[PDB]
């Protein structure tokens, strides 16, 4: 692929946080604790899943990011409206308003519903991730094998501003601490 140029500077939300996250100082990093980490409740924070919004909202244009993975079991990656539901618990789909990838349990799939089987022969360690506002595309890239396509959704309904999107992941196994890191352009 040749959308690199489209790269934008993507930092975390604290506010959108679940409270057991810990985001680096930079806004860069995000990672599960290993309890409550001492934060006011908000109508904003994800309650049920570790989850976290960037800052940034997309309205148009053509946008490009890449997010670090490594040696993680568990996480979900992209884009969601800005008014996705927060408390409870929801599915990740486009009918809920999420354009989003994960790994869970050694495979690869796409939020879907139902969701698809993703088809990766190299494990990627890192993630780009491409929205194109106005043609209605989310497109992921597995940056380890050479850019190579993971997945795209087309003809998308946005249906409001887009936030870039993160889910670091439960650590029932212990083999889940490592964080989510947006990479340098
Ligand atoms: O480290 C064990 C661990 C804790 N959590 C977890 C689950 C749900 C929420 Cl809402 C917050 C944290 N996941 N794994």
């Avoid at 993630?127 to 106005?134: A, M, Q």
Wanted: aromatic share 12%; with cysteine; charged share 15%.
């Amino acid at each position: 692929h040749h959308h690199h140029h489209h790269m934008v500077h993507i930092t975390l939300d604290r506010n959108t946080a679940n409270s057991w996250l810990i985001i680096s100082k930079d806004r860069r990093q995000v990672r599960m604790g290993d309890t409550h980490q001492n934060v006011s409740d908000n109508k904003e924070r994800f309650s049920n899943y570790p989850m976290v919004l960037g800052a940034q909202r997309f309205s148009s244009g053509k946008m490009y990011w890449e997010v670090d993975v490594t040696q993680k079991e568990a996480w979900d990656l992209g884009v969601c409206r800005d008014s996705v539901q927060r408390k409870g618990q929801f599915s990740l789909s486009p009918e809920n308003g999420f354009w989003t990838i994960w790994l869970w349990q050694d495979s690869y799939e796409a939020g879907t519903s139902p969701q698809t089987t993703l088809h990766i022969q190299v494990p990627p360690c890192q993630i780009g991730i491409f929205v194109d506002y106005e043609a209605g595309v989310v497109s992921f890239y597995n940056i380890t094998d050479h850019g190579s396509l993971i997945y795209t959704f087309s003809e998308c309904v946005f249906a409001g501003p887009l936030r870039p999107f993160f889910n670091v992941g439960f650590n029932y196994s212990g083999g889940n601490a490592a964080p989510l890191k947006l990479c340098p352009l």
